[PDB]
């Protein structure tokens, strides 16, 4: 019940067609009343030159997830949402498998949303934490 | 003379082979004694679903640029560098053309580097600003 629009995973995934999220293999995986989850492969598409997951790729995942979450929480006939501020601590390096991100709301205001996004590799250890501020903008 | 290793643009670009930077069309473009510059296309590879440059893609560019800059500033037989913290304000949306990033050093310490990275679209207006903290790590 965080959501205004009920998350439809197929449509979330489909909507990424011809964008970076599709290019990187980001997949919306699960949701509940308080969270939305997506994962992303750790391979050549997402590696930095030394074969570790690129820190910016973590942020593509987090910002893709957070911005999508914001879209599910506004009146889309009245508003759209763009990223305003993003930050992240890179905690542990990942070489293979997938990285999984979970987004939860810190604050959903009238003009801004703040999302807490937690990332971990397939061993379940925290790999990155991000905070995303979205701007809520009238068309 | 910021640099330890003199920037070699061809080799910088070549080193991205089979990583996200190659996948996204990031290109190292110029450097001087105080800065390093890379650009990235704004198109389907880098777009978010609404056809604007994905904010995370800005951060892939900034973090690619900053981490490469860090590699040019350490003793690579003694150390490597990984992203530690990154943050960015998204200032203006971009739909097409390229986005160009310039990295300058804020602080190069023994265990951390802080880089200031300024992004703009082809109209020269600031599109994003990032600050990147790299950790300098002994192999």
Curated annotation (Swiss-Prot), chains A, B:
This is Putative esterase PA1618. Keywords: Hydrolase. Gene3D superfamilies: Hotdog Thioesterase. One of its GO terms (molecular function) is 1,4-dihydroxy-2-naphthoyl-CoA thioesterase activity. Belongs to the thioesterase PaaI family. PANTHER family: 1,4-DIHYDROXY-2-NAPHTHOYL-COA THIOESTERASE 1 (PTHR43240:SF5). One of its GO terms (cellular component) is cytosol. Pfam families: 4HBT. InterPro entries: HotDog_dom_sf, PAAI_dom, Thioestr_dom.
